[PDB]
C-alpha cells in the first residue's frame, strides 16, 4: 500500500501469534515493542531516543507479519510509549519513502 | 525522490537561512531541530519519546525547504540528538510510505 502521513502510520502486526498495533517509524533504527512475553532467549540491551536511554530485551530472529508482509528479525521489548516498527523490519517488507 | 531505508533517511533541509541534515521521521508528529538561535516569538513545550520528555521551544510559521520542496510550519527547538522532520512538514511535501 501507499500510506499518507496526515495521521500516525499505525498498522496491525502479528507477533508470537498475537495481534498488536504498531507505528511505521522511519526514524527508528530498531523495532521496539511495549512489554510483552516473546519466546526464546533474549539479551539485555540499551537504546536511545529523544528523551534519553532505556533498557530493553533483545530478541533475535523473530517472525513478524506487518500488514500481511513477512519479516523475521530483531525485536526489542521495553518501556517505549508506542510499539514501533523500525528500519530493520521496514527494509524487509520493501518499504520506501517517496515524495 | 524515492528514499530507501537501508540507512537513516537523512536529507538536506534549509531553515532560517541555514542548510542542515535532517532525518525524515514518520514516527514523529512534530519537527524537532537541534539547538539553534532562530529569531521570533516562541512558547515552551514538552515532547516525549523513548527515554522520556525533553523541553523545547515552539516556533510557528517557519519556512523549511526539504530537498527543494517548500514547507512552512511549526518547528520545535531543543536538545534533540538529531534534526527530525516530522509529519507536520512531511505531509506538506507529499511524502508517503510505500510497500
Amino acid at each position: 500500500p501507499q500510506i499518507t502521513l496526515w495521521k500516525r502510520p499505525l498498522v496491525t502486526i502479528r507477533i508470537g501469534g498475537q495481534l498488536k498495533e504498531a507505528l511505521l517509524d522511519t526514524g527508528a533504527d530498531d523495532t521496539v515493542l511495549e512489554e510483552m512475553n516473546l519466546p526464546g532467549k533474549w539479551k539485555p540491551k540499551m537504546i536511545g531516543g529523544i528523551g534519553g536511554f532505556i533498557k530493553v530485551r533483545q530478541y533475535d530472529q523473530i517472525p513478524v507479519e506487518i500488514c500481511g508482509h513477512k519479516a523475521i528479525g530483531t525485536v526489542l521489548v521495553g518501556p517505549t510509549p508506542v510499539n514501533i516498527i523500525g528500519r530493520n523490519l521496514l527494509t524487509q517488507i520493501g518499504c520506501t519513502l517517496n515524495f | 525522490p524515492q528514499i530507501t531505508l537501508w540507512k537513516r533517511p537523512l536529507v538536506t533541509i534549509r531553515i532560517g537561512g541555514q542548510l542542515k541534515e535532517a532525518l525524515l521521521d514518520t514516527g514523529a508528529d512534530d519537527t524537532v531541530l537541534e539547538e539553534m538561535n532562530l529569531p521570533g516569538k516562541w512558547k515552551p513545550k514538552m515532547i516525549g519519546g523513548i527515554g522520556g520528555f525533553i523541553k523545547v521551544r515552539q516556533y510557528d510559521q517557519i519556512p523549511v525547504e526539504i530537498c527543494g520542496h517548500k514547507a512552512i510550519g511549526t518547528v520545535l527547538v531543543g536538545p534533540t540528538p538529531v534534526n527530525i522532520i516530522g509529519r507536520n512538514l512531511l505531509t506538506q511535501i507529499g511524502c508517503t510510505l510505500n510497500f
Binding site: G48 | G27, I84
Partner: peptide, 4 residues
C-alpha cells in the same frame, strides 16, 4: 541504537 537510535529510536526517534
Amino acid at each position: 541504537a537510535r529510536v526517534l
